[PDB]
Amino acid sequence: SIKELAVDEELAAADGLIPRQKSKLCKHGDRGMCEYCSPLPPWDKEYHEKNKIKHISFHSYLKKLNENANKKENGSSYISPLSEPDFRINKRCHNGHEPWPRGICSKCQPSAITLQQQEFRMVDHVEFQKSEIINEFIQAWRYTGMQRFGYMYGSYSKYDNTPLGIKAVVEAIYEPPQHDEQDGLTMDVEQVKNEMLQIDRQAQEMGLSRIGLIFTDLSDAGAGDGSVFCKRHKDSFFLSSLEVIMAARHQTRHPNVSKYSEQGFFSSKFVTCVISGNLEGEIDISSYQVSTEAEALVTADMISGSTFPSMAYINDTTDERYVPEIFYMKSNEYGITVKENAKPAFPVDYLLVTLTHGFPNTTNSKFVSSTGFPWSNRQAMGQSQDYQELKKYLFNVASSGDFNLLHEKISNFHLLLYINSLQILSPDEWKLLIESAVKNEWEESLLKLVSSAGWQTLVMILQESG
């Protein structure tokens, strides 16, 4: 199926109006309304500037496009309000010529590209269900001094602190196999793709989607504080050009389904978080996405990292790639822009959108526990998933009859993945285990689980190990 997400259907059905006060300057009577005091549309620029909201939401943006479209004279052919930008040359155009690089015409030749700060964002906010999730991720760095990469799992729902907002709600982090170092890390892309395909399938059975990525850039400041260097700030960079390219690739691989787009998709709800030092030398999180222009640049293979982290390098025209003139709308301190040449390299922050982040207050968290059983791919930290560990974690509790404690133990993302990897439980029993871990009313499921053949078999296997 290819339907829209529930949150999108819900926000399309909201109107997002913002009532205003009548003004001293209104020219009508003591009662009534006019265009100067009437409710604001959800995309209202001045409202967002006034409340320090850096981008309008996706659904505010879509409603803005729809209103402009409805100004066409009626009868005119319908046009989808959204379209994913595409900067790729058509290497199969035979319109009175042989295809690139042996010919070119107005139908196949990319015209000049103008980059500017994107006015909307697909996701507005990243909410981590528990601080323990982030803190255990950070522990990989704390223990090793090496950086860490993870994929975030969860869902999307409404965010009320901006007009028609959306938040990504993070329930867990999965760290793929990786070689970590003090100043970076390397993944085998094929290995990771293959592994995450399997995790995606299992996470979906738990009601989870892969909703973003997260990484550390943490360096001890050398003061014994536990304090770290601030590397990312207004006078340096926020995301490097390498990281923007990474985010763009992920966004394009995780398209956002939209019935209002020519292509049936538009951009992505996939979010990018970085954990690094803030101006006070504290460990903190920053959340981003990249623009649709960034998606299109990277799909067209037009940009590369550069030796200056704040800058993207623009690639050359080849037999496989066509790079037109590229400009960007360079902003001054008042936000006023002037068109400038983006070649040979340009500031990548024009390709960024910023998101807010936070935690909920004291709780529909999917997993009761976030820690206590080793996360995946942590053998180098001395945390391996094996029978010895599972027995230590689970065995005595599983035979105590304490379902509160058993529930706390099995309601654990990495625990569930490990147990399913053992292929002891049947699909039916695996489903019971998931229900026991994530349902509000879990006790009935757990009672069925514990009485099942597969579970009794698992418990016996544990008993007879060690």
Binding site: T307, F308, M311
Partner: peptide
């Protein structure tokens, strides 16, 4: 001035830029 191309393969992350 201007930077050089630093075209790292997909899946390689680097943070060791001079502060």
């Amino acid at each position: 001035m201007e930077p050089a191309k630093l075209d790292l393969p997909e899946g390689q992350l680097f943070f060791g830029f001079p502060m």
